[model samples]
Target: TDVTIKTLAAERQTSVERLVQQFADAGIRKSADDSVSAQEKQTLIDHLN
Candidate 1:
């Protein structure tokens, strides 16, 4: 299954807006309305770690 920004934010315990900003900070270029693949989600999580 894919993950949206809202879901990701909820998973991370942060706001959707904040997750969007974190994606930008990590050079991910994903918006809050975008859906991400499992690989992409894992990549983002890895980036934060």
Candidate 2:
């Protein structure tokens, strides 16, 4: 399944709001309704790590 902010939050056992804040902190634009591309997902993972 394509990962959106919602799905990613679910997989990470986090809140969408928290993920949104993290995305903003990482300088990545994301929305609760938007689909996350593989590259974007990698960026998010990298930032978290």
Candidate 3:
């Protein structure tokens, strides 16, 4: 199964808006409703801790 930003948010019990902002905060831009690259996903999770 593939992972998406929205799905990732669901996985972590978070909102897509929050995740979208997370990406934006890191200078990355993409729709939180669709799939994304592994590198960005890494950064997404990395920022949480």
Candidate 4:
């Protein structure tokens, strides 16, 4: 999931740090080696605002 952080940050119109914080707040932890669910991942990608 190389693009996970970047994509999420971009979608959320925030920084990677912000997205990471949001993930943490949601109890969603992603590692460099982690893979997000396609459906769940798409959900994040679909909505930002």
Candidate 5:
């Protein structure tokens, strides 16, 4: 399924602003309205870990 940043933010229980910041830290640029990446899931994994 195709997921957007906001959706991911919902799953992560965080705001889009924070998710976007984490993604930026992971060197990935994405907006709340943008569809997400599989690699970006990896970004969240390490970030949340």
Candidate 6:
């Protein structure tokens, strides 16, 4: 699955690009970096999903 930003944007009426950037600004390194655990990112992803 994708990140929280993408999922949240899909659920609500907002800009996917904006939410994706917000996720990046919020330090969501699920794809780029592994500093943040996959489980944590998955939790957020699941919540949005």
Model 3 CA deviation exceeding 4 Å by range = 15-17, 29-31, 35-49
RMSD of each: 4.8, 4.9, 4.9, 6.8, 4.5, 8.9
| Evaluation by TM-score, superior candidate among 2 and 6 | 2
lDDT of 1 by residue, 1-49 (tens): 4466656655654444354556566655454656533334344465569
lDDT of 5 at 2: 39
**For model 5, what is the alpha-carbon lDDT of residue 46?**
71
Best-performing candidate as measured by TM-score = 5
TM-score (all chains, Cα) for each model: 0.34, 0.36, 0.36, 0.28, 0.37, 0.27
lDDT of 2 at 14: 45
Q: What TM-score, to 2 decimals, does candidate 4 have? A: 0.28
Clashing pairs for predicted structure model 1, backbone only: none
lDDT of 2 by residue, 1-49 (tens): 3366655655554444355546656765465656432234444465678
Task: List model 3 lDDT by residue over 1-49, tens digit each.
Answer: 3356566655654444454556666655444676533335454476777
Candidate 3 lDDT (Cα, whole model)?
0.53
Name the lDDT value of residue 10 in candidate 1. Answer: 57
Candidate 4 on 1-49: residue-level lDDT in tens?
Answer: 3345535454544344354544544455442333222223433453454
Q: lDDT of each structure? A: 0.52, 0.52, 0.53, 0.42, 0.56, 0.40
Name the regions of candidate 1 deviating beyond 4 angstroms.
15-17, 36-49
Model 1's lDDT to the true fold?
0.52
Residue 6's lDDT within candidate 3 is 62
Candidate 2 residue pairs in backbone clash? none
Q: Count backbone overlaps in model 3.
A: 0
Q: How close is candidate 1 to the true structure, as a TM-score?
A: 0.34
Q: Model 5: what TM-score?
A: 0.37
Give the per-residue lDDT digits (tens) of candidate 6, residues 1-49: 3444434444442444344444555555332222222223333454366
